[PDB]
Symmetry: C2
Subunit: 545 residues, 2 copies
C-alpha cells in the first residue's frame, strides 16, 4: 500500500521545481493530488508532463486555478476540489514567489516604481505588497478556505525557507513575508490543533540545482564580493557533509528529493503525533529560532544623552501613546519629530502639547507610511532647520485591537489590512530611513532605528507574534545590507537597530520603561547584538527597583 | 523493498516498551537489528518474543550484553557487532532508566542512603551517580565506540525526554542527565557531521501506557495536588488533540508507535539532510528550547545592599577565582562563608585574605561537595555563629580546562570525571541547601542560589555547553519544587536562583562583571524570570559604558 493511500492532497505551486518532486513522490505513494497554479495552461502542461514521467492514472491527478491575494479565486478553487473529491486530507502550502530582488533602499512599493525598475533591464515583476500576497497571502488564504473541509487527523505543511532566519542581502521582499508565515504557521497550529488538524513547517535550505551556485555567484557580483561568498556563508553554517549526485562527501545543498520525502512523511499518518513542529532540511545549518534577550535592568538614562541629536517617531492611530515615548526622548535632551498619519491628530496634539507645555525641541508633522514620497519630503523639510535625524523609532500602524480574530476566522480585511499596513509600513519606513541616511551620512553618532510592538491586546497577541517575526527578519536584512555596503565604501555610516516587545508585560509602568530603553538604543553610543529585546513580565522583580 | 533495506541497526535497551517497538518496525522495513542490554536472559527472552510477533528471519536479529557505565563491556559489545556484520548503519540510544523518584531535598547520593529508601517500600533502585551512568553515561559511551564503524550517510538517534526541558516533580535525577544528553547530542552533531554521520535527537512526550496514566496519579500524590493535575499540566501544553486507543478525539498521550515510526524515518536515507535537529513527538507541547537572555546592563550595586545577610560560596579546584567573587560580596556589606574542598587550601587562603587585608565578615571553612554529611554540619556551625545563609553561590568543581577534547575523542576518565564531579556536585549542593533552607525557612530575604560557569577553554567550550543545559534543568526543577512546596504550606520561603554563563566573554573585567551580577541576584530583592544569564561578548558595546 502507499504511505499516502486513499488521501486527497492539495499542492500550491505544483508547476515549480519542489512542487513537481512533491507531486511525483505523492502519486508514487498512493495520494490523489490536486495541483494549484495561477495559470491553467502552465499548470495543465506541468500536470500532463508529470502524467508522462510517472505512470499514474489521469483520474489520480487534478489541477485548478487559484491565486492567493484573490480570495474570490481561492474559494472558487477549493469548492471545485470539494465537489470533485469531497475533502482535503493533506494541504502543502508550497506556493511562493522570488520577490523583488532589490536592497532595502530600492524596494519598488508603487506599480510605477516597479515599471521604472523594468526600464533598467531588471527581472523583478513584483511590488513589495505583490510579494506579500504571493508568499504570505497564499498560505494564510488557502489554509483558512481549506480548514473546514480538512477532516480530523489531516495535515497542513507550510513550506518556509531557511533564508527567513538567515541574512539574504537584496532579498528583504522574499524573507520577511516567509518570516511572517513562520509565526502564522505556529498560530494556525494553535487554532487547528484542538480540531485534530496538524500544522507543521518545512524550512528547505538552499535547494541543489544546476543554477544555484551561479545564482549565488551572481548575488556575490551584486554586493561587490569575491564570487563564492554567498555559498561559503551557508556552507560554514552547515554542520553536516554529504555525497549527493554521485559526487564525493563535501559541503553541498540538500536536494528536491529530501524535501519531497519530508512532505510524504508529514502528509502520512506516520507524523500524526507532530504539531506546530519545525523541519529544517538544511544539512544542520546552525541558526537560532529567535535572536532575542529579556531586559534585566531599569533603563538608567541622563539629561545630556541626546545633545545634538534629533529622533523621528513614526506614530500610529494612538498618537497619545507615541507622545509619551516622545516625552522621555526630550527628557534625555534630544530633539523629536512626532510624525502622525492623520493631519486631524496634528491639530489635537499640537494644542494638547501647549496644554502640558512641551514646546522646546518637539515639532509635530504629518507623516504617513501609506504615502512615502511625502515621508521623504517631510524629512528633507525637517532637517532644513539644520539638525539631521540621527535615530528613528517606529510604532505599529493600526491601533491596538484593530487587528483581531482567529487566523482562519479573521475577515478578508484582517489579512489584507494586516499585510498592507503592518508589512508594507515597516518596509517603507526602512527604505525611507535607509535613503535618508544615504544622503545625510556624516551624523554625530552612527544612525540607529528601533521598531516597537503593541502592548498585550490580551486575546493572545496573535498579530503581535506574526509582526515580531517579520520585523525581526527585516532588522537582520537591514543590519546586514548596511554592514556590507559600509565595508565596500558605498556608505560612511552603518545603520544599526533593535525591536522592543511590549506584549510580554501588562504592567501600567511598561510604556515609560519601553520608551526609557528606546532612548538608550537611540541616544547612547551602543550596539545591541540580539535583535528583538523583550520587556520582562514583572519589572519591579526583574530589575533592582 | 524495505524502507531500511540493507541497514545494520544497534538499539540500546531494546527489552523495554519503546525498545520492542523500535525493533519491530525496523525488522518490518528490512533492517538487520542488534538488540542490546545489561541482562542477557532479559535481552534474549525479548528477542524470542519479537521473532514470533514479527515473521522475522532469526538471522535478521541478534542480542549483545553491554552496561553503559562500564566502557570495557561496551568496547567488547560493538566488537562482536562489527565482527558479525562489518559496520553500524544506525545507532539508537534508547538506553535510559527512570532515576530515583525523589525530590531534590531527598536525593540519594551514597549506597547507604538508597538502602534507607528500599526499607521504605519505595521503588528507587538507583543512586544519583547510577541514574547519570544509566541515562547519560550509556549514550556517550555507546556512541563514541560505535562512531569509528559508522560509515558516511550514517544515522545516530538519541532518545531523551521532553520533560528534560519542562519541570518534573521529584525527578531531578531523570531530567538533569537527560538535559546534559540534549547538549551532548548537539556536540556529537557537530563533531561527526563533518564525517557525514547525522546525529539527531528524539524528544518523546509522556508515552501511552496504563502504568504512566497512574504514575501521574502517583506524582500527583507526592506534591499533594488533586489526581489528574499532572495529566492536565502536560495536556494543557499540547496544542493537538487526537483519536487514539479507539477513544473519541481528546488530548491524549503519544503512542510508542509514534516514537517507533520516527526512528524508521530518522534511520532511513529519507532523512539524509537533517543533522543536529530535535524531533518532539509530544502532540505539539508548548515548551521553549531554553529560558535565557544576555546581560544588556552593567552590575550596579550599593555599600549596604547586604548588611545582615550571609552568602555561601562553594569553591572548586581554583579558589583564588572564588575569593575575588567573595571580595565583591563583602564589598556589598554581606557576610561570606568561603567553602574550599581541600582542607590544605583553608590555611593557604587564610594568609592571602590577611595579606589582601580582608578580615571582617568573611569565614573560611573546608566545604567538600563529596561529603554532604560534613557540608550540612559546617553550615549549622555558621548558623550557630548567628546569621543564617540567605545566598548560595556554586563554582565549578574541577580546575579550568581540565575537561577538554571533543566528546568522541575524549579520555575514558574525562566522561567519568565530568559526570561524577560536575553533575553530582551540582545535585549535592542543591540537596544540601534545600535541606538547610527547609531547616531555616525564616530568612530576612527569600533564599537565592547562583550557579557560575567556568571561563572559556577557548576550544568550543564542549564541556561548558553540556554542563550548562544540565544545570539549567536542575534549576528549573529546583524552582518548581520550591514553588509547589511553598503553595501547599510545606515551606514558607520560595527558593529561586539563576545560572551565569561566563565563557561567552573573554574580557579582563569578566570576573568583576559576574561577581557583580551574583551580588544583585543574591543580595537584591529580585526574581529574574530567565534561568540562564549570559555575559555579552563585548561589555563595552551592549552597555553604554
Ligand atoms: N528553490 C529554492 O531556492 C528554495 C529554497 C528555500 C525555500 N523554497 C520555497 O519553496 C517554494 C517554491 O519551491 P520551488 O523551488 O519549486 O519554486 P517554485 O515552486 O518554482 O516557485 C514558483 C511557483 O509557485 C507558484 N506560485 C508562486 N506564487 C504564487 C501565488 N501567489 N499563487 C499561486 N501560485 C503561486 C507558481 O505557480 P503558477 O505559476 O502555476 O502559479 C510557480 O510555479 C517557495 O514557497 C519557497 O519559499 C525554495
Ligand atoms: N515512557 C515514557 O513516557 C518516556 C518519557 C520520556 C522519556 N522516555 C525515554 O525513552 C526511553 C524509553 O524506553 P522505555 O519506555 O522502553 O523504558 P525502558 O526501555 O524500560 O527504560 C529502561 C531501559 O534502558 C536500559 N538501560 C538502563 N540502564 C542501562 C545501562 N546502564 N546500560 C544499558 N542499558 C540500560 C535497560 O536495558 P536492560 O534492562 O535490558 O539492560 C532498559 O531496557 C528511555 O531512554 C527513556 O529515558 C520515556
Amino acid at each position: 500500500p502507499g504511505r499516502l493511500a486513499g488521501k486527497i492532497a492539495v499542492v500550491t505551486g505544483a508547476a515549480g521545481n519542489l512542487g513537481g518532486h512533491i507531486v511525483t513522490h505523492y502519486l508514487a505513494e498512493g495520494a490523489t493530488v490536486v495541483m494549484t497554479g495561477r495559470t491553467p495552461d502552465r499548470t495543465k502542461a506541468a500536470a500532463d508532463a508529470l502524467l508522462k514521467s510517472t505512470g499514474a492514472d489521469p483520474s489520480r491527478l487534478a489541477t485548478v486555478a487559484l491565486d492567493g491575494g484573490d480570495i474570490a479565486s481561492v474559494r472558487a478553487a477549493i469548492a471545485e476540489v470539494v465537489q470533485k473529491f469531497g475533502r482535503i486530507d493533506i494541504l502543502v502550502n508550497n506556493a511562493g514567489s522570488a520577490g523583488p530582488k532589490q536592497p532595502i533602499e530600492n524596494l519598488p512599493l508603487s506599480p510605477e516604481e516597479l515599471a521604472a525598475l523594468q526600464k533598467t533591464g531588471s527581472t523583478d515583476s513584483e511590488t513589495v505588497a505583490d510579494a506579500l500576497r504571493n508568499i504570505f497571502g497564499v498560505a494564510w488564504n488557502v489554509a483558512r478556505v481549506a480548514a473546514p473541509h480538512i477532516p480530523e487527523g489531516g495535515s497542513i505543511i507550510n513550506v518556509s525557507t531557511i533564508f527567513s532566519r538567515t541574512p539574504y542581502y537584496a532579498r528583504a521582499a522574499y524573507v520577511v513575508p516567509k518570516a511572517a508565515m513562520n509565526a502564522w504557521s505556529r498560530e494556525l497550529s494553535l487554532e487547528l490543533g484542538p480540531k485534530g488538524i496538524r500544522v507543521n513547517l518545512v524550512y528547505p535550505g538552499p535547494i541543489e540545482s544546476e543554477r544555484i551556485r551561479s545564482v549565488f555567484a551572481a548575488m556575490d557580483a551584486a554586493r561587490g564580493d569575491e564570487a563564492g561568498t554567498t555559498a561559503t556563508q551557508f556552507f560554514d553554517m552547515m554542520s553536516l557533509e554529504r555525497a549527493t549526485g554521485g559526487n564525493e562527501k563535501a559541503k553541498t545543498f540538500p536536494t528536491p528529493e529530501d524535501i519531497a520525502t519530508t512532505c510524504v512523511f508529514l502528509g502520512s499518518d506516520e507524523s500524526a503525533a507532530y504539531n506546530g513542529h519545525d523541519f529544517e532540511v538544511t544539512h544542520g545549518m546552525s541558526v537560532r529560532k529567535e535572536q532575542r534577550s529579556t531586559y534585566l535592568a531599569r533603563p538608567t538614562m541622563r539629561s545630556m544623552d541626546g545633545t545634538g541629536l534629533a529622533v523621528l517617531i513614526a506614530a500610529g492611530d494612538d498618537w497619545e501613546e507615541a507622545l509619551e515615548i516622545a516625552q522621555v526622548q526630550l527628557a534625555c535632551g534630544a530633539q523629536v519629530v512626532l510624525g502622525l498619519p492623520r493631519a486631524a491628530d496634528v491639530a489635537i496634539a499640537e494644542k494638547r502639547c501647549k496644554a502640558l507645555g512641551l514646546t522646546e525641541g518637539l515639532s509635530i508633522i504629518r507623516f504617513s507610511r501609506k504615502d512615502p514620497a511625502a515621508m521623504e519630503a517631510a524629512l528633507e523639510e525637517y532637517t532644513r532647520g539644520g539638525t539631521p535625524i540621527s535615530g528613528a523609532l517606529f510604532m505599529p500602524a493600526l491601533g491596538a485591537g484593530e487587528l483581531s480574530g482567529a487566523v482562519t476566522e479573521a475577515e478578508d480585511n484582517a489579512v489584507e489590512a494586516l499585510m498592507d499596513a503592518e508589512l508594507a509600513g515597516n518596509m517603507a519606513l526602512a527604505r525611507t530611513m535607509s535613503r535618508y541616511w544615504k544622503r545625510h551620512d556624516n551624523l554625530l553618532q552612527p544612525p540607529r532605528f528601533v521598531f516597537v510592538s503593541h502592548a498585550s491586546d490580551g486575546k493572545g497577541d496573535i498579530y503581535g507574534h506574526i509582526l515580531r517575526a517579520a520585523t525581526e527578519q527585516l532588522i537582520r536584512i537591514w543590519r546586514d545590507e548596511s554592514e556590507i555596503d559600509t565595508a565596500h565604501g558605498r556608505r560612511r555610516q552603518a545603520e544599526w537597530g533593535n525591536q522592543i516587545v511590549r506584549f510580554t508585560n501588562t504592567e501600567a509602568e511598561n510604556i515609560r520603561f519601553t520608551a526609557g530603553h528606546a532612548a538608550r538604543i537611540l541616544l547612547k553610543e551602543s550596539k545591541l547584538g540580539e535583535i528583538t529585546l523583550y520587556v520582562p513580565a514583572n519589572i519591579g522583580e526583574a530589575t533592582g527597583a
